[PDB]
Symmetry: C4
Subunit: 473 residues, 4 copies
């Protein structure tokens, strides 16, 4: 199964990235050119290793800053097992990254193990990854073995293990893009969550820095730790007030107790103020983009109607006409912005036929002429039907006018006013204007909408074009 | 009338959601399939019950947090009548929700009482609604009947009645969507008001939490209540300073008196800081969307002219030509962005005829050829007329050029320069270029705009097409 | 001249609102129907009275709050002359508003003095305007003439003169709309300035309220004035610290000295915090809209190229082809988003001819065939020319291919590779492909761009269409 | 080389601004009309002088405010060499600006030395530039030579050298526009960086002002310097706390130590609060524009699909059909918004042919009819091919239907269901519907997609049109 895990298995993502099985099976074979040493970027092992690393790299980036800053002994047996075990998992990841193909913009997944992948990692992120993976602090401690300066350096050297933020950022970005293909995550929701994670991590690290700079200076008499008398407090009361102090600078509220007296404090407060304000300005920006994208369809309709109001304003249309047009837009588009012609053009011939049959088949089927027609012909006619809304009192057809189009009534109560009978109120499902299909003369009756009336109009020219394609009918 | 209230009555919303009466009367009959136990989501009873619940659920969500936090006795007769009466109204609502059809995306309103509605509520919000409706606090008090721990639990158990926020949020969203169909509320104004309501409610609850966590700990010596000496103050001075403290953290101003000394305070301040900053970031985001949507039409014109400036920049047009084009855009579009062809195409044949007659009928009626024509023919010609603005000094028609279009003058003072008379200044309402309609030769006079001149041009080809449809004229 | 001032004079705004002189002179006559009692909303008297009122209403809204709050005696002779003189100017304005026509959306300017204007003001803003104009404080003082309560009421009654904010807001909105027609003020710059004015005015009034509520309570012992010992300080040190306190709550910085001890202070601080945060959220929103509209043209190009990158990504085009396409877009559109077809269609026939002659006349004039042609024919051909950019190495024409288009070279160095001579490098202004105009055969030479090459192509079909219109040439 | 440096050399910017070499060489000659006294705005000397000035003007605008405010003696030999040397470089720049051509909107680069450039600088920025370049402070000191008032004026007079901000702003804007042509810098990234530079500079200057106003008043007893006892502290502890105080007002956090007691402090704090809040509101605005422009392509796709959802909602399509359409959009556009017709129309004939050959040549080449065709004919057919995605189960071709289009299969497994054989599963690269090219009859087999199936369809009409152009084939 080792070859199977290292190879991109047939999944919804694979079949949507590479075209189809025969394409996925071609890529699986391309990996089999190198042996036991090539992992595909989309491989499930890369998926499983990346899910193991991301849990480990959030835990390390939350436990490691607290362990150096708020605990005096980091050479104790539990902290050496934790830092060696994490460093081993991270060092394996560096070896695996040398043998994992890299997705490439405008190309395939670089896969040649000797130079395509090994010489791209070395020229790119190998150093940041080497410094984070290696236990520099333990190497210095072993080489060096006046101890208090040694303990102060080890604490600074063990924060080179926070460069794993490079891998957490890179791995999250790689798998978020794979998930965007696999699912349709809203871009704004994915982006705001990456910042909320980055803001929480930076607030944790700023809280730790606010106690590390005072700790690495032996708690100077003007440091907040000494001034608030929290040098001897428990790690919880030291961490909670350091996070409180760092969150307060970030959301820019105020301070822990008082304004910074010392120069290490005045500068570490200013770094946490600049980091905090930039993160909040970005959160207000990400929040604005999420809020704009939630109401995009309703905002786009309002921008469409406002332009209709500007047309009416330019032509100075009377207020009565301006309300007839507002009532038409409310009852024609129903608050919905869509382009039927563009949306229908994008759809394939089978999906267009299904949408047209659901919308128009019932009404056309009732008409006697289309009842006995071949389903192929009816489907051609159904495409021709155009949707038209007539407001109350409007004359859909006027007596004595040339008849260029017949109407199928989807909804609304119309009324056929004539000279002989003068009383015929057609309702939902009824058809009018039928005679105007092969006579090419003049309409004998006038139909007036008596309520809004949503109708489907087939123009005599369009009927002829579909009729030309099917000669018998 | 019980059947009538439970059934969706013929209203502007019903006739705009379901197509028309015969459709509304069909739905009213669909409800009559189940008896006395089915309420339509659009029913007026659902409207009236939801208006009763929303007033009750704002009152309960404002009175209930204050009653538990700032008043020691909640077993007094007035607070038991208030909490039993509200719990009865809320419990009825749970029974009614089991028998109310649920609007469904992509479908009808689920209406079958036995499983379509009952088994969807149980699998969805029944629990949150059961916990909020039941008086858990009173059930615990009755079962349990060392009392101080009992009073502290009852206070936490009586805040499970704040889960009614689920119903206030769901009911407000259901009826705001019904109102959006019933009226055209701006999406941004509706969304900002839902946040201002949610921000005010969260600020009220954070103020109460800031006194409840200290109260449930017997006012510990480091709590703000004890430090500011407000343990024995009136409920007004305790509530006002707790709201002041919670609003200050939310708008991120500062603190009530000093930075939090205790760990319950440092953590409850940090929760109110994170809740407050996220609510304000969302208010700055909702404010940006309201401000962008108020000036959408003016912003869209500026983006249209900026593109004209970019065309002029690419072609490096001289500054004099760039000002002639700016003056044309000011006097043609008048600061208004609209697409006449798209806006006219959307309108039905009667509304298009009305807009065209108001804009063009007066001018065409003056012309002698169109004066005696059948109103049907004139309406066809009026559609052909195209609107054209000629700047001062422009030559609308040049002598000796082939004549392909005649001009009707809506506004502006033109002037007919010829060789014989050489002085004829036509003004508003005048027509020129008329001879170029059936001669198909060359123009004998040159007309120069002497002011901006808004004219309507009928091309000889368009005159022929309308003339082809009406043979006699 | 009294009739002339009350009548809308022929100005750039009048001639752009009403169509032209004969339309403006028609409106001037419509005003002359009522006598000495009708002022047109666009009248210059309305302009001059509104410029007098706006200076007076900013001065009153800045001097009047300070005079009541920071000065004990407002019955002194200088403050009675100032408040009577301002009240007289404001009372005249109420009389004039009864006789000024009101611009109406979807209509003309309501002008009938007896009911169209008088009964619309009474039903609209007469009350707010009556309360602001009348000296209620002086009427109460005269009627009432235990004095300390009288002085406290008069101070509250004299703040009903701050309702003139209604007129400043209405007059600024009326004249900003008139200026938008008169000039093209950016909407965002006009809107941000209205808020900066409203924010400065609300900050001034919040500063005064922070000292008025303590003053109207005889400086209670817990008020900030008494706690900071500023009861007996000069009006400058009392106003400056009250503005500092109100600006600090508004920009949400902190407090003047300490968090509010009293309940009048805790509530007046909370009102100034909610007013301040809403104004700042709106300033961040107006700033976002100004910043987005400054770079609209550059942002729109980036959105256009990003879509080209998405087309290339979907088709998985090789990285080399992706760079050829990026270089084409840089050298064809030059970072400019414009639609030549839409921008040209909007322009009138004279402006289109001028832009086409400047862009193309020099190059076409050099060609021998078009040199002797009638300027009418050349102008028709110049419209047909299409702009095309060929990248270095591209083959503009290939030997042996059917010739459907000739090329005029605007810029770039091409090269004619043939079999006989095989060396001819054409440069700026040169024409190639000329033989392919009346032969309808095959090209004998292949022209390869040797640098980018911006050329104008005239298709043989387009040459024939212009040639069809002019038979002799 | 002096003439060469002053002349616009042939560079990527020059060849993209002026059309090509022959155009650049024409401009180089236009400069040679004036002698040794005309520098082109795009000249490399202007580039090199502007890069020298910008380093010098950032250094002066950072060192000069600190030198006046935090150092008592500015007449010392090192500060006189620094201020004379910088003033000499700045005075040369004023002389050079008199002889450098100015880029002009809508025109060429003003180049005539006597009046085009000299009389435009004098009427524009000569004064601000003269006041900044001249050492006013030293001129006053020499003329004047009771000394403490002289030292206080000199400190105010030496801040007229901060008007060089005019040149830093103008030079940065000129060279950022030149770089935008030279490279495609994102507008949002360039604009946010100009603000981060302006915010850092204003925060530096506000920190210095907070100590200069107290210094110029002899450290009054209520000034923060005296109250925090920092009058005698080192320049580092005075500057660091003044910057801390000014950054705190700007990001609106709080204060250095306490709220301002004196009136110089209450007003200098209010100026730094208004300057700081306006800069942060602009940073939140620039951050919103950068964040919106990073995800423009993904946001635009979501707005396109939301409109498809609104079309489906208006027609009330069943939920099953709504999921077939969502799956089509995911597998047709693949999350990418692009307009193939618009993107292809913009590209030149060679780039369109290359994109079409890469996308379609392999599949068409396999077909036997197109295998022996002339490459010219195949390229014409390849343009006709249209891309179509058929979902699983869809019938691409139905037996007995008239055949109007043949299909080339790019990806997916189809299946040819017939009556005779009834089993033929075509895969990637296969072609079906071929017989429907010259028969004009009815299809004998029905092909059903058995997986998504991305195919290229050539319509019989389009095949005929390309076949009409090439008669032999
Ligand atoms: C961060 O601040 C700096 C910014 C910059 C540079 C240095 C900086 O450090 C002070 C480098 C530089 O000069 N260029 C880039 C050098 C690359 N070349 C290709 C562009 C430059 C060289 C040249 C020459 C030109 O004359 C034709 C010209 O057109 C005006 C433009 C240019 C501008 C950016
Ligand atoms: C809800 C719909 C619109 C889909 C949106 C998907 C969202 C909710 C998902 C997709 C990927 C997710 C992210 C994946 C990984 C991380 C990194 C971690 O350190 C913090 C959480 C964070 C940032 C997740 C937050 C939630 C997330 C952004
Ligand atoms: C003014 C025009 C554009 C129409 C806009 C309608 C606005 C003003 C209306 C429509 C529905 C209304 C909301 C309905 C119910 C609630 C919940 C309540 O707890 C707070 C107020 C709030 C949130 C209302 C605020 C105002 C509101 C949003
Ligand atoms: C600079 C270009 C884009 C044109 C923009 C015009 C701007 C600068 C002008 C037009 C009208 C002006 C406003 C007119 C009247 C007032 C009310 C006053 O109490 C404060 C200033 C304020 C709000 C002005 C600010 C500047 C303003 C908004
Ligand atoms: C990264 C891609 C998108 C290109 C963007 C270019 C950006 C990073 C470059 C282009 C020009 C640059 C600016 C040029 C000059 C200055 C003035 C200086 O006082 C502060 C930095 C600042 C403001 C630079 C910041 C970075 C900058 C804005």
């Amino acid at each position: 199964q080792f070859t199977s895990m290292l190879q991109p298995g047939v999944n919804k993502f694979s079949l949507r990235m590479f075209g189809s099985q025969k394409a996925v099976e071609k890529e699986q074979e391309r990996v089999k050119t190198a042996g036991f040493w090539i992992i595909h970027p989309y491989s499930d092992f890369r998926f499983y290793w990346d899910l193991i690393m991301l849990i480990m790299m959030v835990g390390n980036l939350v436990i490691i800053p607290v362990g150096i800053t708020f605990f005096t002994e980091q050479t104790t047996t539990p902290w050496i097992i934790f830092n060696v075990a994490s460093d081993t998992v991270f060092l394996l990841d560096l070896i695996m990254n040398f043998r994992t193909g890299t997705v490439n913009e405008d190309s395939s997944e670089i896969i040649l193990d000797p130079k395509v992948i090994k010489m791209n990692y070395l020229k790119s992120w190998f150093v940041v990854d080497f410094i984070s993976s290696i236990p520099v602090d333990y190497i210095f401690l072993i080489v060096e073995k006046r101890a208090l300066r040694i303990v102060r350096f080890t604490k600074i050297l063990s924060l080179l293990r926070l460069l794993r933020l490079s891998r957490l950022i890179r791995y999250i970005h790689q798998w978020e893009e794979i998930f965007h293909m696999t699912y349709d995550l809203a871009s704004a929701v994915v982006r705001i969550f990456n910042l909320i994670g980055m803001m929480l991590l930076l607030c944790h690290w700023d809280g730790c820095l606010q106690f590390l700079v005072p700790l690495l200076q032996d708690f100077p008499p003007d440091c907040w730790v000494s001034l608030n008398e929290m040098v001897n407090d428990s790690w919880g009361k030291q961490y909670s007030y350091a996070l409180f102090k760092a969150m307060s600078h970030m959301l820019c509220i105020g301070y822990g107790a008082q304004a910074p007296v010392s120069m290490s404090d005045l500068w570490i407060t200013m770094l946490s103020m600049i980091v905090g304000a930039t993160c909040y300005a970005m959160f207000v920006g990400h929040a604005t983009a999420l809020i704009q994208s939630l109401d995009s369809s309703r905002r786009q309709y309002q921008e469409k109607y406002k332009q209709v109001e500007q047309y009416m304003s330019f032509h100075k249309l009377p207020a009565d006409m301006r309300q007839k047009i507002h009532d038409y837009y409310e009852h024609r588009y129903q608050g919905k912005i869509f382009d039927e012609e563009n949306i229908l053009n994008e759809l394939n011939d089978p999906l267009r036929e299904e949408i047209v049959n659901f919308n128009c088949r019932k009404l056309v089927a009732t008409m006697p002429l289309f009842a006995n027609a071949d389903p192929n012909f009816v489907t051609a006619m159904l495409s021709k039907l155009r949707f038209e809304v007539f407001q109350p009192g409007d004359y859909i057809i006027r007596e004595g006018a040339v008849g260029k189009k017949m109407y199928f009534i989807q909804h609304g109560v119309a009324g056929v006013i004539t000279k002989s009978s003068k009383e015929m109120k057609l309702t939902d499902g009824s058809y009018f204007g039928e005679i105007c299909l092969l006579t090419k003369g003049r309409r004998t009756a006038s139909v007036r909408a008596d309520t809004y009336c949503r109708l489907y109009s087939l123009s005599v020219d369009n009927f002829n074009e579909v009729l030309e394609e099917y000669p018998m009918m």
